[PDB]
Amino acid sequence: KKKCIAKDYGRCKWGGTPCCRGRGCICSIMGTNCECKPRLIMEGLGLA
Q1: Helix (H/G/I), strand (E/B), else coil: 37
Q2: Measured between alpha carbons, how far is 2 from 29 in angstroms, rounded to an integer?
Q3: Partners of 11 in beta bridges
Q4: Three-state secondary-structure class, residue 36
Q5: d(CA 39, CA 41)
Q6: Which residues constitute the domain of residue 35?
């Protein structure tokens, strides 16, 4: 729907719908569970 996903944590794909608001489609490093996450959690919970 639309040229992106304005739904925070919105299932997305590096080869499909990215994010609207301007989130980053991050997956579980397995090309699966891809979702656009907002900039509400800078850094990376467990740093490394």
Answers
A1: strand
A2: 25
A3: 35
A4: strand
A5: 6
A6: 1-48
